[PDB]
Amino acid sequence: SEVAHRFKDLGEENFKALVLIAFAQYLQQCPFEDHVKLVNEVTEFAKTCVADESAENCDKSLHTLFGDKLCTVATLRETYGEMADCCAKQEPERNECFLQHKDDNPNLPRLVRPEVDVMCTAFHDNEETFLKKYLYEIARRHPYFYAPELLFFAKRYKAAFTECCQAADKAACLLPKLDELRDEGKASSAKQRLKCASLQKFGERAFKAWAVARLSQRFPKAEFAEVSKLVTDLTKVHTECCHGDLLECADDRADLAKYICENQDSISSKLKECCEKPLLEKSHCIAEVENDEMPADLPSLAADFVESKDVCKNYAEAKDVFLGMFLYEYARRHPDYSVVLLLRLAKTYETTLEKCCAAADPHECYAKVFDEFKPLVEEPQNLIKQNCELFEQLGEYKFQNALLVRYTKKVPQVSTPTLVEVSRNLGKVGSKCCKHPEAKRMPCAEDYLSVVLNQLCVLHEKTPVSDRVTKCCTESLVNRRPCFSALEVDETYVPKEFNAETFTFHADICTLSEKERQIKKQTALVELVKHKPKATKEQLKAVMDDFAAFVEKCCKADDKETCFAEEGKKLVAASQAA
Numbered sequence: 001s002e003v004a005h006r007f008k009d010l011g012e013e014n015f016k017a018l019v020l021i022a023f024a025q026y027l028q029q030c031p032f033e034d035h036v037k038l039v040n041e042v043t044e045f046a047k048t049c050v051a052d053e054s055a056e057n058c059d060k061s062l063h064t065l066f067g068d069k070l071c072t073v074a075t076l077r078e079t080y081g082e083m084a085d086c087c088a089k090q091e092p093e094r095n096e097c098f099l100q101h102k103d104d105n106p107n108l109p110r111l112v113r114p115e116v117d118v119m120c121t122a123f124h125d126n127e128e129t130f131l132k133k134y135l136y137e138i139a140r141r142h143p144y145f146y147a148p149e150l151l152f153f154a155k156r157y158k159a160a161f162t163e164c165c166q167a168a169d170k171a172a173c174l175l176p177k178l179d180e181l182r183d184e185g186k187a188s189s190a191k192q193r194l195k196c197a198s199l200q201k202f203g204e205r206a207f208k209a210w211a212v213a214r215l216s217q218r219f220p221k222a223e224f225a226e227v228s229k230l231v232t233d234l235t236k237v238h239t240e241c242c243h244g245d246l247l248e249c250a251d252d253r254a255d256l257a258k259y260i261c262e263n264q265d266s267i268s269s270k271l272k273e274c275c276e277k278p279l280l281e282k283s284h285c286i287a288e289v290e291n292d293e294m295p296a297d298l299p300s301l302a303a304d305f306v307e308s309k310d311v312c313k314n315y316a317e318a319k320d321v322f323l324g325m326f327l328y329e330y331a332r333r334h335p336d337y338s339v340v341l342l343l344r345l346a347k348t349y350e351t352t353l354e355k356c357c358a359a360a361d362p363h364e365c366y367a368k369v370f371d372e373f374k375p376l377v378e379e380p381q382n383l384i385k386q387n388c389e390l391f392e393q394l395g396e397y398k399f400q401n402a403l404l405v406r407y408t409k410k411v412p413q414v415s416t417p418t419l420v421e422v423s424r425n426l427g428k429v430g431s432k433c434c435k436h437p438e439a440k441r442m443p444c445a446e447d448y449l450s451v452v453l454n455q456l457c458v459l460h461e462k463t464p465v466s467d468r469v470t471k472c473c474t475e476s477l478v479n480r481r482p483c484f485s486a487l488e489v490d491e492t493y494v495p496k497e498f499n500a501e502t503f504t505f506h507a508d509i510c511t512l513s514e515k516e517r518q519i520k521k522q523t524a525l526v527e528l529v530k531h532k533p534k535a536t537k538e539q540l541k542a543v544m545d546d547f548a549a550f551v552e553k554c555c556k557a558d559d560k561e562t563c564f565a566e567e568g569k570k571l572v573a574a575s576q577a578a
């Protein structure tokens, strides 16, 4: 019995929560009350299997049980329609079909949060429903959220209201925390979407490689064999979470933590404090810990991987173990190399070996391999330096605008809201990484960008328009960023001539946050460039100034939406000439 094993292992509290997220990530448009009804029926059921594992149904697989139960509300197409398709299939077709239809951009409201007192009224009135709501809203919006982490944040959500709803000034306590969790939440989600894309679109060999490089950069003292064991374990975990198998993911992550802490001495020295933490924190902590000291003595790379003889012999006998060793050795020495750089280097090594082992002087042709790595190292460093140069002169907001312009010219077929969300997350690199010194700049940035471009890749894949986006995304996971970097203004592109409705704003603009107000200005920008790229000097950064003033002047004009219709029409036309 599976539903039993996982109840015993996770306990009722987590068990209940994971199931909520499973259902919410599979049926996003479906309402809260329904998912809560469903989860409860499964929990009622799981307990019976704990009492008696030979009971009827207990030997069904979790998808079987979870799927049957979802479909008791999903088959109704008049509401969903397409989800009735998976419901027609048996497993494993149906679970494949549910994954197939996870919406990265679901037509869901923006979640408004009421005032602190209302909120705190809801929390003490019934904190169990309040929390269930939190899990519900995030997962349905983030169908690939790493479920074990969603539990760790729910704890932080709960603890905030617990504390802050007794503070003398509740808001000042609460709002910083909620926002930090909103922000920290978004970022986990993106990180986790790149993991699932690796696995689902490129295969586990990719995930391993990324994992091998990554884990090794953190645990350079550890033997390859050990890392391999951590990787195989990490792989299984995220493979499970990416296939919808959330109980088993959560559980396996918990075992991985337990193991990591039992064997600190074989893994790292930065762990001691994480392993004293509570169970939920214990794993998150581990994932966000600084690198261990690099072993004082290490031999040169070249010996084992160039200057040795019978390099092909090892390559032949076990290439995946030979290339993994390279990747391990190279990564543990180079914690300033982004993980994707390490993966291109590792690929450039594989391709060369294929060429050289044919026959003639190998020990010669593959001598200058390390020479072949030099350009790959600098190419991205240049861009970070350069794009950090531009950051401090422009500030975070103006820099985004520049990236918008850059990326909107780059790939102008792309949906506007996409361009904006993306360009802004791209812009966020400056603040995060430029802060640092070069030693930690490259991995910070280039990897952070990897997350943001995979973001673009998925939101695009949904409804593909530009062939250049589809190319850079499908071509090669590791090479996505150089691929976008190298693109240039699209000559093919026929502009859309104009529109009236798009630029004359309404009064509600004044009542929105600077956050959302910048977003309304940044949309405006993106449309203009769509309408007029051919010419695109400062005149872009010029006519932006023309809208921002028009926004704030009419939001302090004291007039009944007058200038928005009258003075808003004078401007929009003027730039078509100007």
Ligand SMILES: O=C(O)CCC[C@@H]1c2ccccc2C[C@H]1NC(=O)c1cc2cc(F)ccc2[nH]1
Pocket: 194, 195, 198, 199, 206, 207, 210, 211, 214, 215, 218, 234, 237, 253, 283, 284, 286, 287
């Ligand atoms: O399972 C988790 O706790 C989240 C993953 C966190 C991972 C962890 C865990 C312990 C020690 C170091 C580290 C590094 C940390 N991330 C990765 O290893 C990692 C794998 C991976 C695979 C991809 F296709 C793309 C990005 C990736 N990052």
